[PDB]
Each structure stands twice: as C-alpha cells, then as structure tokens.
Design a protein around this nucleic acid. Sequence first.
DNA 1: ATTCTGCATGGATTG
DNA 2: AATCCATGCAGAATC
Length: 106
Amino acid sequence: IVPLFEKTLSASDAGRIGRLVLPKACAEAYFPPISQSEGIPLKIQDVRGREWTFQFRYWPNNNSRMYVLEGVTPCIQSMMLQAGDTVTFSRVDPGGKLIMGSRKAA
DNA sequence: ATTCTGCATGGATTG
DNA sequence: AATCCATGCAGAATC
C-alpha cells in the first residue's frame, strides 16, 4: 500500500466544475504516462472500495503540460469533501490499483 | 442561462 | 528566472 501523493483541494477542484488538477510532478511520477492529450480512463477506488472512474488527461500550457482528472464531482461529493480538505493517492503493490484517500482540515 | 471545453494568464512558487 | 496551477474566459452545447 505504497502512498504516493497529496493535494489540498482548491476552490476549483472542490467545486462542481468537474476537474481536479494534478501537480505536474505528481501526475508524472505516479500516474501512468500519457502520450496523447485525450488521456486514459483511470479507475480509482476510495476507502469503501467503491470504484470511481475519472479521465486522466492534460492540456498544453506554454509548451508544457497541465494534468487534470475529469469527472471528479460525484466522488469528491461522496467523501463530503470541500476546499481546504486534502485528497491523497496510494497504490497497491500487486496489480497497481490506485486508491483515493482524503482527510479534512483543522 | 447554464453547463461543457479547451485552453490562457499571471501571482506563486520553485529552481 | 522559469514554470507552475488556480481560475478566468470565450465559444459550443444544452437546458
């Protein structure tokens, strides 16, 4: 159960827009590498083992890339998360299932 | 009249 | 001193 990264949800991530940005460094060290901009359907599951499915994609951004998970709103809702709170990611050694954790802020 | 969508921009933040 | 990333935004769909 290797843990990978953490990200405090900003207003845009926790809002209903539907897109949680991933830190470029994080998304590139820990999520599958993506060649094309459309990206990969990425299957995470939460602490209750419910499998949610996001779209892991990027956009161009000053010749760099900007990585984002789309489709996040119902899952974040299900954790009763809001901005300030932090979301976390981990992996499981066999099969590499990516697991989403969260913790609320003080 | 409201949500997708595919990016830009510039204060932060990092190197 | 360079490149993030939180969010603005303008057009296309959609209510």
